[PDB]
Amino acid sequence: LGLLRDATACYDRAIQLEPDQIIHYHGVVKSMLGLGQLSTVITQVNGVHANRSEWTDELNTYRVEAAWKLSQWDLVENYLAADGKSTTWSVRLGQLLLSAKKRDITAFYDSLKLVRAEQIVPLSAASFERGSYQRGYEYIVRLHMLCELEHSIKPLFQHSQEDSLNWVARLEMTQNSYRAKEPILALRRALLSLNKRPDYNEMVGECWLQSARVARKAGHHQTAYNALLNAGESRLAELYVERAKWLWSKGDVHQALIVLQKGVELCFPENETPPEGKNMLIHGRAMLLVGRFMEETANFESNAIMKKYKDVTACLPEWEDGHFYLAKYYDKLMPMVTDNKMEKQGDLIRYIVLHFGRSLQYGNQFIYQSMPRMLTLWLDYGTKAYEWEKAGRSDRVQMRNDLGKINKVITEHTNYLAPYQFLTAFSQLISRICHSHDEVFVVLMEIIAKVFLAYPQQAMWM
Amino acid sequence: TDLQTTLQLSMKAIQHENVDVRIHALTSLKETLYKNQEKLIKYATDSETVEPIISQLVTVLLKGCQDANSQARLLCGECLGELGAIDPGRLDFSTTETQGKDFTFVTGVEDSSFAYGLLMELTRAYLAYADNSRAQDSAAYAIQELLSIYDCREMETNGPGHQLWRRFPEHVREILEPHLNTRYKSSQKSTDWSGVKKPIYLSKLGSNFAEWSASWAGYLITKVRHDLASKIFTCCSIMMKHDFKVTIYLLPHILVYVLLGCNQEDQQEVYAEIMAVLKHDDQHSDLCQLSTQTVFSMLDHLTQWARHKFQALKATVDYEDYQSVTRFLDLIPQDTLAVASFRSKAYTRAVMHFESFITEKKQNIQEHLGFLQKLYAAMHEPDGVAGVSAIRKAEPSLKEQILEHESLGLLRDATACYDRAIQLEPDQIIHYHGVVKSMLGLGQLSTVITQVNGVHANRSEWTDELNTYRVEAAWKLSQWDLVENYLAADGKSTTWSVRLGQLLLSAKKRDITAFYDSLKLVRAEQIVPLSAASFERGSYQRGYEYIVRLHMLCELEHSIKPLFQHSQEDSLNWVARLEMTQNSYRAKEPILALRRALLSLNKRPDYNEMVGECWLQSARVARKAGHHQTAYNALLNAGESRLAELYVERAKWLWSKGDVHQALIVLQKGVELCFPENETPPEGKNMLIHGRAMLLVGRFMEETANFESNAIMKKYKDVTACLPEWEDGHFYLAKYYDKLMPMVTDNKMEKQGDLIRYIVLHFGRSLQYGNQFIYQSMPRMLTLWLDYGTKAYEWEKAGRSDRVQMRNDLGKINKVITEHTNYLAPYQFLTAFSQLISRICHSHDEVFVVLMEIIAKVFLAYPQQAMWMMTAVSKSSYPMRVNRCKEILNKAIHMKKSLEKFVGDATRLTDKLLELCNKPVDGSSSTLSMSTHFKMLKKLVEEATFSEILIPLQSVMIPTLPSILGTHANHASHEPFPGHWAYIAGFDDMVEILASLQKPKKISLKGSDGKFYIMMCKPKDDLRKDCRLMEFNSLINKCLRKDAESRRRELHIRTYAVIPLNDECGIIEWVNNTAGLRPILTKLYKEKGVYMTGKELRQCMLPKSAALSEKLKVFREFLLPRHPPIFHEWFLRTFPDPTSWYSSRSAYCRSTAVMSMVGYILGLGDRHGENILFDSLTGECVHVDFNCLFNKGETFEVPEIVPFRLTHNMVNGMGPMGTEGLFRRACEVTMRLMRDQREPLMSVLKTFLHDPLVEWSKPVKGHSKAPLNETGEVVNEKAKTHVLDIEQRLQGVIKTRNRVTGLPLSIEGHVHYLIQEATDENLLCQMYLGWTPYM
Ligand SMILES: C[C@@H]1COCCN1c1cc([C@]2(O)C[C@H]3CC[C@@H](C2)O3)c2cnn(-c3cc[nH]n3)c2n1
């Protein structure tokens, strides 16, 4: 159970205690290897080799893993010729990458068959199906890796055919864990290095950023920081965004906001438009992250946060996250603004259900936060307007008109949105069936009926 | 001998003139320290501040380390090690030194002072060259020609020759008179000066420093147009050719003079020379460095003379002379001066020239941020590296990140960046240096050795510089054979670690000679940076690292000498020698490593265990410092003293990481594994540790929500029963009962009675065993007691049945407080005297009787301070306060009759002081005389019978508490207020009247020492609030002195005395050499010629009700432009010396930071320009007029929207980086301290917010202060609110009305918000023109 980066200290204490013990020297380079520190690894094992020329043979694998990650193909050659007894995965991957660099078609395909069989063997024993696929994901991500490899190398040999593997999608398809995504990404960097396309200096920064993302999402932040470093050489605004997200993870919301503001004014200066599609998308992600930081920080005024979210929506209207977080903030403010008085909440409710629905039109990532909250606000305001109309309160007619606006917004959603988007929360809609307000009931009827058509069998049961 | 008289004598001898006497005194003060180490450790450690003698000593020591002789320079450091590396916060350094400074830009050869300087130099050359006749005869000719150029002989006249002959010393005069009248002949080897290449520097004659300097001086003397200048230059021409020093001294004048009469071509020639000295670096000899210094000095004198000539200009031909000097000073490029100073390793002057280049010549800081960063790295000012990293928009390059981290000290990030750099450029030794250094500081020693051997395999040449780390690891591992092999490899490695390895090895092989020689060597190379640093102010803290290295060398020498043939056992108290040090990792860690290595050399039996205790101490240090990973690397290296000293430390480590539950878990595992429930530990050490652990378990429980309160109380009571003599346990139990009592009593005092009794009892029992919480325990104790007495009076007046039960409970509590009175020491009450002087008007009679016993005990112990603190309560208008104080004083008198004449005398003196104070001014008089108007006061004071009354300084009014380390029993005879006590011996003959509307009458109180102390008397005002505020500020200055970051920054809330002689008057102590911001900036603006008259200001004023945008438009269009930034000109004018300039600028940034945040916390307002004051000597700021406290300003008709004052002028002084840099990180540091010490601060403040005596409600309330039937207490209605707001501001919370729930801000983010808010033009504009937000 990896406590944290600092397992090396324990291995070194062990060494001080039993220096002849090798397992510890293995553990040290292995930790330095995981925490970037690639070039540091190569010196560690060479020092050991000097002290004890016998251990290097079993430590050669770590000197090879570092080399092909650094893309030092000449070094790979020496560290491989030194010892052929090692069959560690990293060593075989280095052998393949070298056979590709020094184009050796026969050797490449042969060693490929060989390693690919080596990795299947653990699956053969784990093939007995008791949650096997998850027990062997490590060996299945290795086959994924070998296939990415075969498809990136084949063109380097042919000259024609080229790689059709969608490297992006192939990654989200995987388990969102560093133990799985990173090996794919380091191999992808090495493959981008073997080939040399003009973008293949930039795409490497992209892969380093993805590695930082998976690490961050996976907790350990220092290797993420190393990846970020290795991403700088490529000019990107995503770098500032990810550095902020990384600080945010460490809890330093303020330093993150500061960095992100620096990156936005530098990468997206106010003068020139950001409308390069990709640049626009990044500018929107960044302004959103800014509005989200500002939400956490108490200093920032609510109006400025609302304005930032609105600018995000205007930069990316087809984007879900923008509308969603904007409406979330409207909802967080509305009780405080309105003094927890519904009749005053009408227009805010309109904006909130509106942006919630737009969010659902473009994506269903937050549907469990949005559709329920939207329907709840709407049905509740309907109950309240029926009450105040029933009580004869003064603001009731204004409440009636605002409820009309909101019923219209809900209708526009009913038309734009997909019935399955309503399907989740059908139990909620089947709940407010007895809503008192008639027009609200009509909107709810058109909503759940539009669902009944799409999915009657599953609806009639509910 | 008491060892204090011995130290006085010995120090006097240290600073003796004869070098041999100095040396023998130092040597005697190196056997003296060793033999009296126990006593010295009692001094430096018994109290939180090192006893005065120790401060006088280290100060006399360092200045000694500047001693020319190497043997005395060594004996100095040695005594600094035999003495210990005391924490610079313990050291006073009140007056560390007063360096002499030429108080002019000597006008020229006409000036009598420059005359005397030349004559001193010529006589010095005469005495020096008596060995070489030619040079001495040249000197005699020069000196007679000086006597001629200007008369040096009075001839019985009062002419210049008179005061000049009197100006020379007697030895110079006896040298002069013989040759004063005798003619001498000059060499007359005249030179055309054409053949020499005008850029003389780097020429053949140039390559010789004295030769270049002499040739340039000759060419200048030829260019000189002024006649007297030509004479003085010709007479010393030969001397300049003989002595480089006379030249250096006279060159700036040659420059000033030629520039005045030089034609454009001549100016260009001299400019070519000067710009060539600076543009040259090395080989494209000491010549470059020395000549760079010389030209820097010439230019500095030229600038001083330009400024003086401009003073005369505002005060013709002199206009043209000033124009010439300004022209030339402009001709030279500031950037070149900066790069030169840097190359010359004069980083401060380079910083000054760079700041000028940025401001004097409008430039964009971003292009030059990198150079500034290199400078701040070399200056080792990390706040500067950070301010640059922040001011920078662009993405930091790899190398820049490396620098930022090397300054930050983040080992992890530095390691990663260094490896990335190695990948980028593999052929860099510095990156591998950083990698191995990171692997070393993290504790990965063997990893270090292997990395080194590997890089040696790759690059052999690379190893000899990397060997240091291999050998450091080895001697840390105790692999002495590897140490030997590695040391045999490096023949020239001089680094500290290698020398320490050599010493340790020599000790391992028992090579006495080698050890002691390499010790005299490894000890001199450390005293060198100290001799270089001793010249500056705050040198101890600058050279602490090296002082700590000297402490380490002492510990070594004394742990090894028994290892040799061998009384010679090491008598050092390692634990105390460590506690005395600074509570930082950078200091205590190397000490501990060397301690464990010395042990590993001695291999005594216990030493296997002592190594574990040293590792645990290192872990605790890194934990208290935040280096958690190193704390873990240590918790591993330990295991021998595992009788819960490990489990305890591991639990604390986790707690610091925030994992409270895992901490409690592991700690319970320890308490079960060791100190098992089945067998009680009675062992003293085991018992102490078991108590520490039970208490940590109780604290964790309390932090955890799951645990029931009763279990927590049980655990704390178990602590008390196990370690009852312990302050903790008692204290924490009472603190819990205090948090628990409101809940258990539903906030009803009635049920609180018995809980209050227990709480008070345990708070006092804690105060009996230790004073670690004298500030958190005593105030709450007294508050609970006085308040329960108040509620009892209230309910006995109301007639409630519960009133009788309250009476019984109050009797119990009063008995408890009486037992405390008898047990506790007087000073423990003194630290809260102001609170007790406050309750002097308590409603309950019995409570007041007990309070009176307390106050009278304190008085009978420390009468002067008490009287000064309670003189007001006696003179107040309320009759109740007066009667209570008279009763207290009469009680004290009955206790001790001697405190009767002193009482009457102090009362008379105070009466006359407030008479002087409430004096009707004659009108237009800048001064009133003491002998004419205030004669009766001078009479009272001058009378011999008159008792001795202290000059009520802050250092004498604010106690010094003993240290928790001080055996916890010192507090029976402990002496607060240690040092020199100065009594009111006489009053000066002049009584200045200030220009304020209040017309405060400044006075000067003559101290018994004879020194003159200045004390202002404020006209009608409430100084009591200010008094208790100065108390809080002294507590803050304490908390800052102890904290390492703060003290490394030298943070300090400037503090002075605020003594109220009445409710209307007080007598504030005057901090000398202080001028306000508004007067300063107005003087500078006038000199600049741009100024805003009152009429313009009234026109610029908008109606109080106006568009914010309009106020801003006016404040940006007219006010700000008319008032540009000049403060930096003040810094440059008052601190001409570059080093002094940077020191004072940094201290301005770091002191206004402290007092800004201190103020925001205290809700400080009314920070107008005349209330902020800046010290002309140190640049620190000193606030005044603390009448508006706790956001009372926001109630002013013109609300205060600025939390503190950061105006564009105030920023321009901080530098080009502005807020970002030193000021911001100092704000962060002090806010962090305030937040960590939130509890003591809040506890003392709640005694300030609820103080009844202070006039919280300024209005009369229908002359309430007279019309109180039986009360002297004015309640603070906004008390709880102010307390809550302050607790928020400390927690990081800010109340936000923009419909937001809220969340605590990080210290960095809180500081950023504060700064933004205080420098935001939109807020400044709203401020009344009294704040002078434009200034
Ligand atoms: C450091 C200086 C000199 O040393 C003594 C302390 N002190 C001053 C100076 C001033 C002023 O100079 C400020 C402006 C300009 C002229 C006049 C007086 O109004 C005040 C005002 N209030 N207080 C108070 C009250 C409680 N503590 N301090 C002052 N204390």
Curated annotation (Swiss-Prot), chain A:
Family the UniProt entry places it in: Belongs to the PI3/PI4-kinase family. ATM subfamily.
Name the record gives this protein: Serine/threonine-protein kinase ATR
UniProt disease annotation: Seckel syndrome 1: A rare autosomal recessive disorder characterized by proportionate dwarfism of prenatal onset associated with low birth weight, growth retardation, severe microcephaly with a bird-headed like appearance, and intellectual disability.
List of residues that carry Phosphothreonine: 273
Residues of the full protein shown: 1712 to 2178 of 2644
Residue span, FAT domain: 1-462
Subunit (UniProt): Forms a heterodimer with ATRIP, forming the ATR-ATRIP complex. Present in a complex containing ATRIP and RPA-coated single-stranded DNA. Binds to DNA, and to UV-damaged DNA with higher affinity. Interacts with MSH2 and HDAC2. Present in a complex containing CHD4 and HDAC2. Interacts with EEF1E1, the interaction is enhanced by UV irradiation. Interacts with CLSPN and CEP164. Interacts with TELO2 and TTI1. Interacts with BCR-ABL after genotoxic stress. Interacts with UHRF2; this interaction promotes ATR activation.
Tissue occurrence: Ubiquitous, with highest expression in testis.
Effect of residue 273 to A: Impaired autophosphorylation, leading to decreased activation of ATR
Mod. after translation: Phosphorylated. Autophosphorylation at Thr-273 in response to DNA damage promotes interaction with TOPBP1 and activation of ATR.
Its biological purpose: Serine/threonine protein kinase which activates checkpoint signaling upon genotoxic stresses such as ionizing radiation (IR), ultraviolet light (UV), or DNA replication stalling, thereby acting as a DNA damage sensor. Recognizes the substrate consensus sequence [ST]-Q. Phosphorylates BRCA1, CHEK1, MCM2, RAD17, RBBP8, RPA2, SMC1 and p53/TP53, which collectively inhibit DNA replication and mitosis and promote DNA repair, recombination and apoptosis. Phosphorylates 'Ser-139' of histone variant H2AX at sites of DNA damage, thereby regulating DNA damage response mechanism.
Subcellular location: Nucleus; Chromosome; Nucleus envelope
